[PDB]
Design a protein around this ligand. Structure first.
Ligand SMILES: CSC[C@H](NC(=O)[C@H](Cc1ccccc1)OC(=O)N1CCC(N)CC1)C(=O)N[C@@H](CC1CCCCC1)[C@@H](O)Cn1ccccc1=O
Length: 330
């Protein structure tokens, strides 16, 4: 079996991507944020505090004939950006791009952080990391991908994020049409439960490629590119006027500046992020200061290859026994 769902940016900045997902019977369509950095599939529901819902589409378990309460089951999650959500758990039928999975754990939000209520375009999340991260207790649950794995033609899903445009999430197959050249596969470490890999180095603009091992995670749920201080400083050093602002909390540059591209290594291959992708617009409406798409990871504890880097390549998440990450130019 296979599945193909179109993923759409929530705004002109590509801050995040939402993908339509069918939940329940009859189907209740919710726009979820596919997150390979988390392993929980939670959604705004009829249970969420009415005060914390602002325009989001809610999942109403009582309206689904295939929905059953997972007695005693609870969930609580907190993301890097500080966001938070919690509540009870239901099991229902979930379909993505035609690919159906029965008995999927659907975590209905009872409490959501302000950041979420603020986001009207995102109805919930679909974690695509490794199931070891699931927050459901006392019985941990499996992710949607883990539940589909067996039924998939190939235990894989690909990420084809668009720049200022829609992209595609495919399950069970590799569209050899969506990329150029060859796919370079690289080893993945599951130890932390992330799609953790090791980049082989980087280059700023047309500069010399620096061979250096960069351990990071493929995170579709993260907007920007978080790299080590040294790497980030070398990039922004090539942008006249760019600087690290304590007030804004990151590297900003003159909106009139031309951003050099960023090259990251995967094996012997090279993925180039056009400079246009690194521009995240005015820090504030009307401001002439722009937010950089490449920030330091010094405070996270881990480097994150977020949307900024991922959307520059066709990404294959091989959920095989020996998971691997595939990167191809597109
Ligand atoms: C340093 S992880 C900060 C990161 N959240 C972001 O990247 C958000 C995402 C976003 C953007 C726009 C609207 C709504 C949400 O967007 C920004 O933070 N920004 C920075 C400010 C803006 N200038 C650009 C946009 C993050 O927690 N991701 C997690 C996924 C979800 C997606 C939905 C919103 C909450 C976070 C996740 O995979 C990260 N994870 C990875 C490993 C371990 C724990 C962990 O938790």
């Amino acid at each position: 079996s296979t599945g193909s769902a179109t993923t759409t940016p929530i705004d002109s900045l590509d801050d995040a991507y939402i993908t339509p997902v069918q939940i329940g019977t009859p189907a209740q369509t919710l726009n979820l944020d596919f997150d390979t950095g988390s392993s929980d599939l939670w959604v705004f529901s009829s249970e969420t505090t009415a005060s914390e819902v602002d325009g989001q589409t809610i999942y109403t378990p009582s309206k689904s004939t295939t929905a059953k309460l997972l007695s005693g089951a609870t969930w609580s999650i907190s993301y890097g950006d500080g966001s938070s959500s919690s509540g009870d758990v239901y099991t229902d039928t979930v379909s993505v791009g035609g690919l159906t999975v029965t008995g999927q754990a659907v975590e209905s939000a009872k409490k959501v952080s302000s950041s979420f209520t603020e986001d009207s375009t995102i109805d919930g999340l679909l974690g695509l990391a490794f199931s070891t991260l699931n927050t459901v207790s006392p019985t941990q649950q499996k992710t949607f991908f883990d539940n589909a794995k067996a039924s998939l033609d190939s235990p894989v899903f690909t990420a084809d994020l668009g720049y200022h445009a829609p992209g595609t999430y495919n399950f069970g197959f590799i569209d050899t049409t969506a990329y150029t050249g060859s796919i370079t596969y690289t080893a993945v470490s599951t130890k932390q439960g992330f799609w953790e890999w090791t980049s082989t180095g980087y280059a700023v603009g047309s500069g010399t490629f620096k061979s250096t091992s960069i351990d990071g995670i493929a995170d579709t749920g993260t907007t920007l590119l978080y790299l080590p201080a040294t790497v980030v400083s070398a990039y922004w050093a090539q942008v006249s006027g760019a600087k690290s602002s304590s007030s804004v909390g990151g590297y900003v540059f003159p909106c009139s500046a031309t951003l050099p591209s960023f090259t990251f290594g995967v094996g012997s291959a090279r993925i180039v992020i056009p400079g246009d992708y690194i521009d995240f617009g005015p820090i504030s409406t009307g401001s002439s200061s722009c937010f950089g798409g490449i920030q330091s990871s010094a405070g996270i504890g881990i480097n994150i290859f977020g949307d900024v880097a991922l959307k520059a390549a066709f990404v294959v998440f091989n959920g095989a026994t020996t998971p691997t990450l595939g990167f191809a130019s597109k």
